[PDB]
Amino acid sequence: DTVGRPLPHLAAAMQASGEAVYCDDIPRYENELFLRLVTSTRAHAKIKSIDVSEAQKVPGFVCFLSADDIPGSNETGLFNDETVFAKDTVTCVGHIIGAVVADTPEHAERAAHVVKVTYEDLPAIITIEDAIKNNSFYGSELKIEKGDLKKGFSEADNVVSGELYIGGQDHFYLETHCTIAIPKGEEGEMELFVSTQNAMKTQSFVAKMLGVPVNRILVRVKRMGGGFGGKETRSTLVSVAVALAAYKTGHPVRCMLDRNEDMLITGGRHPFLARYKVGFMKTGTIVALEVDHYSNAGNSRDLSHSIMERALFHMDNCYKIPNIRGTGRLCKTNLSSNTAFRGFGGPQALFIAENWMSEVAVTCGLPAEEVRWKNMYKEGDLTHFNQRLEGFSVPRCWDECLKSSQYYARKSEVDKFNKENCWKKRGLCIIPTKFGISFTVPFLNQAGALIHVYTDGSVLVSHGGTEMGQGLHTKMVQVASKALKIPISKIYISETSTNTVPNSSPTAASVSTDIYGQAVYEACQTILKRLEPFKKKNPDGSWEDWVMAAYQDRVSLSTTGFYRTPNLGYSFETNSGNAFHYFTYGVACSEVEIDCLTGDHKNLRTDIVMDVGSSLNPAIDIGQVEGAFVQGLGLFTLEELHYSPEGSLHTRGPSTYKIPAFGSIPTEFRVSLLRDCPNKKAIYASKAVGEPPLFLGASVFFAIKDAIRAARAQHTNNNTKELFRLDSPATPEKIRNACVDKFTT
Amino acid sequence: DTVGRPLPHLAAAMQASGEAVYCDDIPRYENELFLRLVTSTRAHAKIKSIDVSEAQKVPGFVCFLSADDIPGSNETGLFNDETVFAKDTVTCVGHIIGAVVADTPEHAERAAHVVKVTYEDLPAIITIEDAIKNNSFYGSELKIEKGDLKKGFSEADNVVSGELYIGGQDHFYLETHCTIAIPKGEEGEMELFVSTQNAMKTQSFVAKMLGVPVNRILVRVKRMGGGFGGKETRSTLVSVAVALAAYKTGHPVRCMLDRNEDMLITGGRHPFLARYKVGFMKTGTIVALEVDHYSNAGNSRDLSHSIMERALFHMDNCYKIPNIRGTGRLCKTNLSSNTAFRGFGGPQALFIAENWMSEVAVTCGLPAEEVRWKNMYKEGDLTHFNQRLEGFSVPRCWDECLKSSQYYARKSEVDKFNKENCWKKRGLCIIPTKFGISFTVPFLNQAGALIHVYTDGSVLVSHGGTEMGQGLHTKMVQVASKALKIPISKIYISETSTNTVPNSSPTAASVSTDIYGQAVYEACQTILKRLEPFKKKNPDGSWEDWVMAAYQDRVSLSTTGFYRTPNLGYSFETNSGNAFHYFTYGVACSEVEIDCLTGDHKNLRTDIVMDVGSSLNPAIDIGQVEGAFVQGLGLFTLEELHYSPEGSLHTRGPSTYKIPAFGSIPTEFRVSLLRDCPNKKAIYASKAVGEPPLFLGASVFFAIKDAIRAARAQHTNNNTKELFRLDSPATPEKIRNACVDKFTTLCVTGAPGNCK
Amino acid sequence: PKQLRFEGERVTWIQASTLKELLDLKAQHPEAKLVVGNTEIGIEMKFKNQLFPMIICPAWIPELNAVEHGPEGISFGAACALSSVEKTLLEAVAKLPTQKTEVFRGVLEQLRWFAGKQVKSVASLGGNIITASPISDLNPVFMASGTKLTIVSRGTRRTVPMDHTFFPSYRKTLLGPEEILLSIEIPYSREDEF
Amino acid sequence: TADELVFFVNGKKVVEKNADPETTLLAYLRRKLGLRGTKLGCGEGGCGACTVMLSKYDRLQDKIIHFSANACLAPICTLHHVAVTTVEGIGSTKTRLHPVQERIAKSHGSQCGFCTPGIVMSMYTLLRNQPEPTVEEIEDAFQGNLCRCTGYRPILQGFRTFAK
């Protein structure tokens, strides 16, 4: 029984030796061809002509594919509002118009570049500001409201109002999007090898495209080199085009995107704009809050509606607000459709909440920790969406982080550094988070597994979840080993496939361990019950002897397992019903030093205390906390996507888009997991960990703001209670310009 | 509802277009290598050296593999008495010594030819008589005995004893053995595409040889171009070698055997030798029977024991015999190990039975139909192994076949032909069969299925059975469609694989329809039960509507089904308990003309009536009767394997081994399935059909024997009750030699001789 | 060590073994691109879809690889990898008075968080200079210091301190069509010079 | 007309009789030689997924030098008489892991695993030049290597074991 032990990721040794196989590492068939997407260079335009003359002169050119080649249907995407191949009009730079197929990827690259498209430009809508001005939205306003707003504000000592923007983020999974499609030649059957978190939609979108039943399409996923939400639906853009080429040619076909194509085409986190108004007492006690959210959804719905719902569920962070109104709108723009990115709308909404909370504290001239603490939910409290907080552990996390980070002592020393230094300043902030666990769409909270014991007693486990680095398969092996009471060496997970576990939800919402853990567990229980008589007959025997006896007595050693998360069903009409199963909680305290003269900064130290219940694997769970935190630090402090005015992405590679490096991480980086906090609601008292830590990254942003505040108090108009706008990400540009001095002027 | 409808084989259009993919049709990986087995040229010898120096010079040569290369275990075979690769000693001419790996199959072939082996010969045992003389057997004697033999032999008016031999048979599946093995390079993982009836054993034997857990090995089978039992275990001789080459090289590797390799290495039907004694009344009524069977098992056990058990279970054919003793011994010999072949020992023992029955009728000077009928079991009788014959339909099959074949009028015409012709004669025979349905090893009578309904309402069925042409998948879709009450166009079966249904029994014993039918049906009931609330909420909605509502309500649309045949377990110690679930029955009448001067013969007409309960698909079942009958016609008349005195197979291709051809089949060939005989014991009242009709091809053998008897009354002597031995197959040589006349005797030269 | 010729679908590459071959080749093919590290040219061909049908690789030539310590400064062959320049300069800095290494120290500051080891082990000095990106981190240091450039063609030879005139316009430098950059002398700093 | 290109990969002689000047070493390793440990993560020299060690006799310095390079930007035509080492050249789970591979694996420094071979080759190169490096030399070796999964802390901590 290894549950609770820091067992390393099962594949890590093979990952270190270069033996682990990712999609493009699969050998090529002798007749395998290569696909490359031909993409829009205009944000909004009619397609006038497509000329392939030059492409046809490229050695090894096979064909050009376009909407006219599709046998089944050109309508695709989650809400059936996308094309597989654009027909008359393109609606973003990156919009897929067609594909070349060639005998080598180099020849496909060369041929694609020489495909000539003629456009007639149409007027484009790129910014959130543009979309609002044109009422260019998907669907209607989303809203959560509680209490009496025109009572709260009537009562408030003060108000703060303003506007905040947070930029998007590219996923930058180290392995880009990849599909191999193998046409069988019989009955429209096709087998697909795909770097995707959603083998179900892949399968369904390929079949729809082809005009073929879903039972003809087999999708297999060994592992991804990262997904982070980005391979949850947008992987089909490559998969469907590759399936089409396989169908047309009758040959195997593959495509792996180059980084620049991937950044342009496949979408990122949603940029958010927020307009807010908070009313509060002289004490810093919040009495009213009104926030209007706007997301830049891009050129299709995709997951944008659910991402806004999640934002609205997290606009409270860990704070009790008696009177509250949040609204969301989804901006329809001529940009690549934006999608799931780790946090799924939560970090954006949580950041908006911490931004005004920080401005409340400044306005009242109180310590930031004091204002946060005094507004914090208490055990038993209801959220603005009327769900009770049971086992609310932020108070413990807060107390322990304050103590172990030595926050009050170091706050003193920050102040001393600031009084002793002119052109460098230190900041220090401590921030909480809560993150609700479940898909907010009730029907996705289902999970299947399938387990076989073979006659040598070795066990093959299959579940609907996929491995992208998060150690899900490791965790499922620890679960099965514990449940079957056999060592992990007897159990194997090979891959995720639609022919072993059908209709699976995407591997998403941080719930995979919870839901597949339960499926695996139930299947193991079924096995144990079937084996029990044989155990009784041969009590001093071995697992192997029991299995073989069951086999020879014609007892089935194969079973399914299923879990359906109970009691979920939030209603926007009644503002009731649980939206989440439980919440994951955490607190981070971060210190930075800024260079007032350059806008550069150094992350000095970070301490995190995270409630992950009783961890299934502390090493994986700490690894998840550190990974998420650093992705969040990149979102808020480093990573910036930049577009031309005509809506074309400039930042298309690691030289223009900076994700955190070895040297970006805090010099002192401490993560602890909260002790003695079992979670009754999930497998073996554990809690979801994948997404909840990312927002803690914001602690570095508010530490930066705190340091800018000190720099301004030194060189500009001195009002202690002076507020200024700092959007996310806080890049060197923004940090420097905000340090107003004799040089900026 | 297509059950009972003549639906074509679902892959038939694709087979006719050349679009259906068999194993070697799968595209090759860019780096894929080819293997060629290196095999013994001696029946029994010590291996003194293998020299690969000339093979190493062949362009594209990669490596030679032998026993030293194996990482896990060199011990293989069903009873663990084989090697993967022979080490110090070879024990038959096709015995696998090693393998060559090369970059093309032409280069593998070239290099294998030039691998030189040095041997020191050892005393070999090839024939059954060799093995009996030397006491060379596997295991001890098998036996079933009932009644009182001494008492029976005393009450007999007449006793006939004799000896009889039935030659073996090569499967001659049009697609030879073939495996592709794909090494993944992580964790010992391997994926194999194999022409095999037994994915479970393939997976186990590969795992065993590699020394890795079974969960690392995935075996997939889309379809076989024929199996006929020869792919039930012997497929692993090629699979395990290819897996080793894949393991060793880290490349994908394949091997498809040339016909000559396949016939030499992979084994065939067991030749049987029988020594018999029957006691009967002047009426033709049987009172005592004693048969000792001996099979030529070759150089390992394989399925030989079970094949002999099935032979003993069928030594009665359709006849009530109060005092009976049958024994069986397996001969251990320096030939390729013999294996399952359609019928699985049943045809050999049923042939032996019809042979002594044919002699009873001749001794009594009574018409053969009358002697058979008189001796036939009745409804509710027990067999020699004390199983009750419930729903015994041979009486019905017999009557309808006599009537529809116009047997009695045709009997007159054959007599008139024989009266008018000197050097040609006609013969006519009618013969029944019964064939027990179940594996005689109780634990193999288990089956799984796995069914998924996707959100578009399309259904994917997986079961433990493999398609080899018998239309198992076709039948499983017809079953699933009737069970789910949806059109067949909504259901699909892709292939058989060990990661969807584990621990599957081999596709064998004719029981696949029966057992996978039930597993599929049970999975379908499970799905129906889960959809029932949605159907109740929306009784006028569609299948698609109910499926989507169930998905949206988080009800699982995926399940297993399993079936375990009830009430099975025969004991040789008590001669008691059911060996079979039920029996399939049939009757065939066949007419032949022989050329007494050359031994050539013509099949004039055959009529068959078969009890297949309520057919799931009369077109497929009629196809099976016709196909199985023609294989039996081959076994008993055409097909003859022939070895050198040193034990080397001479007959290794269609030029020297003759399976039935278009021109071989009876000129008038009529098959009827018996009407209104539902079988309560199996899926939708159907019965197994695979193997039961093959013995009916013996009707041709016994028509030939009848014709020979006429030739002998004409030219050899005047003894109307003479019993001559005629072994199977009755080839031209055997037929001509049996029509003793002025040429066989040389009396025509002026010499004295043994004719009239 | 002899001249190698490689021929592909669109491009001919010549690996020059001697300085004479290089200068001869550059005279015959004035437009030829000189590849060393390929960290610029490989990018222009992949991402700006540029085609350069004639490439000469001079990385083998001893004169383009020579590190020479003189009275006035340290001279590096144009093909010297940035990691070699770094290591030579780190060695000079640790050995010489602080007052002689002000420029070396500046070059070393620009080299610090300049890509990673992989790029710096193959990127040439001459490559960064002749590429003449507006955002080259080395050209401003070389210009400010008046780093001396030895430029060579078949027959002719010259040494010019780098000044503002060396970069006349976008991605252009003041070398004639037949000319190559041969070596780069980075000067010691003087008394009262910072 | 056209010369042979001769190099070595993981101790083995590679003789290219028809080298195309456009071919990168990454393409050659992956798609001609079938050595798929070395990964494509960007193609523009910024992520180090494609990191390999190159080795050659330096005529000038006299010795054999070892250094890291991005195979995605290395033209094969620059490699005449150079020796390439990839991740598969240093250890395997089938034979024996190199200590660099063991320690990154056991230290939880590999999550999705796609950056792991690149980082392995960066550390390995460092050790071929400096068998007893400092902590600072260790962080420095990885300025060219990106990881999206781990937040980097475990990788440095497992490799610190090699310092002093």
Ligand SMILES: Cc1cc2nc3c(=O)[nH]c(=O)nc-3n(C[C@H](O)[C@H](O)[C@H](O)COP(=O)(O)OP(=O)(O)OC[C@H]3O[C@@H](n4cnc5c(N)ncnc54)[C@H](O)[C@@H]3O)c2cc1C
């Ligand atoms: C990821 C990465 C990060 C980078 N970061 C920085 C950075 O921070 N700061 C910075 O300044 N640069 C940076 N660069 C650019 C790098 O410094 C230059 O790319 C490098 O010095 C070019 O050298 P090369 O040998 O690779 O040039 P090549 O690509 O081989 O050639 C470049 C150009 O120089 C010419 N050339 C080379 N030698 C001669 C010669 N001797 N005579 C005449 N012309 C010659 C060639 O014809 C060609 O036009 C970066 C590059 C990469 C890929």
Ligand SMILES: Nc1nc2c(c(=O)[nH]1)N[C@H]1C(S)=C(S)[C@@H](COP(=O)(O)O)O[C@H]1N2
């Ligand atoms: N190494 C790694 N960790 C990861 C991701 C990833 O792609 N790679 N995806 C994240 C996202 S977006 C989610 S929703 C969770 C999904 O996995 P889980 O449900 O198994 O935790 O893992 C997170 N952690």
Ligand SMILES: Nc1nc2c(c(=O)[nH]1)N[C@H]1C(S)=C(S)[C@@H](COP(=O)(O)O)O[C@H]1N2
């Ligand atoms: N076309 C075809 N029919 C065939 C065979 C075959 O290989 N091809 N094998 C036979 C044998 S040996 C058996 S045991 C049965 C097995 O199939 P079933 O169990 O589905 O009848 O099919 C019989 N009919």
Ligand SMILES: O=c1c(O)c(-c2ccc(O)c(O)c2)oc2cc(O)cc(O)c12
């Ligand atoms: O990842 C997610 C996702 O895909 C969907 C979704 C919604 C509607 C659909 O029709 C669909 O296919 C998916 O909802 C979510 C809701 C969450 O709270 C969190 C998530 O991470 C997801």
Ligand SMILES: O=c1c(O)c(-c2ccc(O)c(O)c2)oc2cc(O)cc(O)c12
């Ligand atoms: O095909 C058959 C077969 O495989 C076996 C068998 C026996 C022992 C084993 O260990 C094993 O794996 C298989 O028995 C049989 C018994 C029958 O009456 C009929 C058959 O057709 C088979």
Ligand code: MOS
């Ligand atoms: O829910 Mo993670 O895939 S954003």
Ligand code: MOS
């Ligand atoms: O039982 Mo059929 O495979 S001989």
Ligand code: FES
């Ligand atoms: S692939 Fe990113 S540096 Fe080579």
Ligand code: FES
């Ligand atoms: S482990 Fe995923 S990018 Fe490093």
